[PDB]
Design a protein around this ligand. Sequence first.
Ligand SMILES: *[C@@H]1O[C@H](CO)[C@@H](O[C@@H]2O[C@H](CO)[C@@H](O[C@H]3O[C@H](CO)[C@@H](O)[C@H](O)[C@@H]3O)[C@H](O)[C@H]2NC(C)=O)[C@H](O)[C@H]1NC(C)=O
Ligand SMILES: *[C@@H]1O[C@H](CO)[C@@H](O[C@@H]2O[C@H](CO)[C@@H](O)[C@H](O)[C@H]2NC(C)=O)[C@H](O)[C@H]1NC(C)=O
Ligand SMILES: *[C@@H]1O[C@H](CO)[C@@H](O)[C@H](O)[C@H]1NC(C)=O
Ligand SMILES: *[C@@H]1O[C@H](CO)[C@@H](O)[C@H](O)[C@H]1NC(C)=O
Lengths: 241, 36, 48, 48, 48
Amino acid sequence: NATRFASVYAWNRKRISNCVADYSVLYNFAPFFAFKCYGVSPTKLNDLCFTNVYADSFVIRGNEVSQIAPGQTGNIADYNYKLPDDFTGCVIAWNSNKLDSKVGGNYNYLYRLFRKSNLKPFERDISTEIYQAGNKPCNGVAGFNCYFPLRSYGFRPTYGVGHQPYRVVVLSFELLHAPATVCGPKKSTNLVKNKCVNFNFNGLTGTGVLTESNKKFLPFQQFGRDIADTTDAVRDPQTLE
Amino acid sequence: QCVNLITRTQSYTNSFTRGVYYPDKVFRSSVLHSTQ
Amino acid sequence: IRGWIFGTTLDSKTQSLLIVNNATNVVIKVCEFQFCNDPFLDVYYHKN
Amino acid sequence: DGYFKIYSKHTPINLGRDLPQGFSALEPLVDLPIGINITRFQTLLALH
Amino acid sequence: GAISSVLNDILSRLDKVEAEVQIDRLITGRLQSLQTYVTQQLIRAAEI
Ligand SMILES: *[C@@H]1O[C@H](CO)[C@@H](O[C@@H]2O[C@H](CO)[C@@H](O[C@H]3O[C@H](CO)[C@@H](O)[C@H](O)[C@@H]3O)[C@H](O)[C@H]2NC(C)=O)[C@H](O)[C@H]1NC(C)=O
Ligand SMILES: *[C@@H]1O[C@H](CO)[C@@H](O[C@@H]2O[C@H](CO)[C@@H](O)[C@H](O)[C@H]2NC(C)=O)[C@H](O)[C@H]1NC(C)=O
Ligand SMILES: *[C@@H]1O[C@H](CO)[C@@H](O)[C@H](O)[C@H]1NC(C)=O
Ligand SMILES: *[C@@H]1O[C@H](CO)[C@@H](O)[C@H](O)[C@H]1NC(C)=O
């Protein structure tokens, strides 16, 4: 909920950290048209926590929301905002013509359609250098069939239908593998030891007995592990035990 | 303003065993672990 | 020795990164830096 | 893939030459979400 | 072929409709692993 969204050619990236991810107040604040998660179910996000979280943020024509799917290929996903096949996260999007579109047109949301090569996942190319889309070279701002970003898609309120500006945020988190910094709204209990319990540490549910270790995790380690890759030991996030 | 300084005279040496690093944020002990 | 310049072009046409380390802390920043040719850090006794 | 990762280690070493044929491992230091192309690098001297 | 080999990650992260499609990959490969072990043990037992 802020005045103007960033352009898709130069997508904004905020790091969410040191806070509680209560999503319920967002879902009851505003509707959305898209809500597609990958490597996670929306149902589970209450009992879960994330290592480092980034929101990728921009405004785009509603057709191109299809291009935000994991590793998909198309004009925005090849040259502007590629996300990988192994992206774990959620995509959320909603119509903005009630907020950003203008009856005289809006031209602030630049985008690109051509580049020298298909860019790498989560890389951004803000360079305004001219592109040789004609066979002969092009220099300065001019050139024979040459351009850099193309014209910003003109947004009018009544003009676009499935084709007006939609605001997009993509939450590109990692989970259950490191000291976590962004957790769901579920409250913690006290600890207990030497008794069988349904434990959950940073979202890592299981069933077992807990005991004090002799093991000496370095400050970067949250979980300790065995030959079957199951978690053998854990660092208690409320006290670092 | 800038000034050209800091001339270099490279030589070659043999990095015997150096530059191993903990590949992930996980604890493991008493094990031989294979990683790419 | 205090830190490193990393980048693709080093002349502001594309972004590039600095790591700078001093007697007390580290700064890390990625920007459209124009680097000249010999990047070095010029710490001095400033009388004033 | 758009992250710049640093690992590091201190090594106490005596008058036994340099770059020693023993063993040591680097701990993780920082994970920087920078999203930029690195192709080249340089290092900062700091003559006072 | 599952997203994790740890069966509790599947059960932490997904709901029933696609959790079961990941779990069944692990049921299939684990069950094949037992079928291999028991066949190998029957083959050795017949030599002993
Ligand atoms: C090493 O270089 C650092 C810059 O690259 C420099 O950091 C700067 O230090 C001062 C003093 O601590 C900070 O001043 C601010 O301190 C607080 C911040 O909340 C404010 O209340 C003050 O009013 C003031 O704004 C600078 O902000 C800080 N710069 C950065 C980018 O963090 C170190 O001081 C240098 N150390 C030495 C020994 O040279
Ligand atoms: C990262 O930066 C390098 C340096 O600019 C790029 O490498 C150049 O790529 C073009 C197109 O393939 C070639 O014409 C150049 O000769 C390459 N130069 C070098 C030194 O390799 C690289 O393509 C960039 N990567 C991305 C994904 O943009
Ligand atoms: C959302 O932003 C508008 C101004 O653009 C403001 O009036 C409104 O109070 C905000 N909503 C919340 C929940 O703060
Ligand atoms: C949680 O509260 C305890 C006191 O009950 C405190 O010692 C601890 O530092 C807190 N956890 C964090 C993450 O600060």
